[PDB]
Write a protein that binds this ligand. Structure first.
Ligand SMILES: O=S(=O)(NCCNCCOCc1ccc(Cl)cc1)c1cccc2cnccc12
Lengths: 315, 10
């Protein structure tokens, strides 16, 4: 069994309405982890129990190099705690914001790891639904880690559909902005937006007003920098096709279609999951508590129904 | 560097 007192609480890494993520050290081992702490009373009051349960189930039942892994889960009378592997490289959002744009080769590396993770999730009948820069982290070696599984839908195989209006506004697929149901191709739209951001340095569609933002997503044609390679233009046009049936990855073979795109001609998809490729960037931390790839906004801040939640990993 | 975004569900 594991409790709150089994850990040192070092630094705030991230924060939302429904929880905080703290860098912790397990006292007995000296190992560092990221602990997500939620308030039961808030989760219950605001009807976030289903999302929290889904997040728990996905974490408990997935194992993939490019998905955040759960070490322990436990609870108290008023709190739920996920102890996850710590990604010391921060969010892809941090890095892209600093660099403005990635090379196509660097974008291809991250893109391949994301495709691998999405292929894996789809193979487990899970649709992720919230691909975005803030939910993609870099681990200590520079590999992608997908985070934030609360918006996943489980039990979606083949062309099964979903109804919930959810995601992140800027990343919503056009079909999600129509009435009725949508399928797993929404994840390839999401990949398209992040790939577009990585190679073009901006969102493909943006307005501060959601009504106008949603009009752009539904109605506006994407634009490309003149100098983007033809293969990059082709990939982005394919992933950001508005009709999910015409979208790259939208057909019956799903991730296969994306993997076979000429943009990824140089990728050995078997090497990808085995982590044989040297990543394009390794976080240059000087210690395990060096939080330089997290915003000072968080790290400076001082720190002072659920039946099947508890979990201890077999690793 | 765009503003940070926020996930939602309705
Ligand atoms: O939450 S994280 O700090 N960073 C990912 C950010 N995801 C987008 C949500 O950001 C707002 C937010 C942050 C924390 C909570 Cl609990 C709610 C909303 C995080 C999650 C999972 C594993 C991590 C491993 N290392 C560092 C940070 C990790």
């Amino acid at each position: 069994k594991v409790t709150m007192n089994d850990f040192d609480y070092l630094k705030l890494l991230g924060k939302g309405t429904f929880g905080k993520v703290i860098l912790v050290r397990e006292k007995a081992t000296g190992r560092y982890y990221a602990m997500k702490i939620l308030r039961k009373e808030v989760i219950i009051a605001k009807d976030e129990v289903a999302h929290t349960v889904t997040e728990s189930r996905v974490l408990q039942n997935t194992r993939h190099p490019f998905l955040t892994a759960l070490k322990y889960a436990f609870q108290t009378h008023d709190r739920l705690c996920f102890v996850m592997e710590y990604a010391n490289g921060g969010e892809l959002f941090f890095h892209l914001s600093r660099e403005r744009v990635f090379t196509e080769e660097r974008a291809r590396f991250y893109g391949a790891e994301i495709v691998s993770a999405l292929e894996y999730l789809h193979s487990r009948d899970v649709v992720y639904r919230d691909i975005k820069l803030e939910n993609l982290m870099l681990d200590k070696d520079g590999h992608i880690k997908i985070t934030d599984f609360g918006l996943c839908k489980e039990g979606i195989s083949d062309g099964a559909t979903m109804k919930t209006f959810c995601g992140t506004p800027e990343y919503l697929a056009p079909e999600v902005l129509e009435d009725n149901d949508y399928g797993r191709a929404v994840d390839w739209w999401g990949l398209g937006v992040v790939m577009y951001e990585m190679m073009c340095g901006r969102l493909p569609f943006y307005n501060q007003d959601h009504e106008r933002l949603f009009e752009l997503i539904l109605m506006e044609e994407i634009r490309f920098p003149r100098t983007l390679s033809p293969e990059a233009k082709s990939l982005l046009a394919g992933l950001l096709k508005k009709d999910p049936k015409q979208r790259l990855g939208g057909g019956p073979s799903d991730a296969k279609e994306v993997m076979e795109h000429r943009f990824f001609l140089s990728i050995n998809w078997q090497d990808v999951v085995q982590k044989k490729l040297l990543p394009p960037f390794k976080p240059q931390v000087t210690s395990e508590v060096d939080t330089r790839y997290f915003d000072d906004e968080f790290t400076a801040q001082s720190i002072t129904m659920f039946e099947d939640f508890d979990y201890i990993a077999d690793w | 560097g765009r503003p940070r975004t926020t996930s939602f569900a309705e």
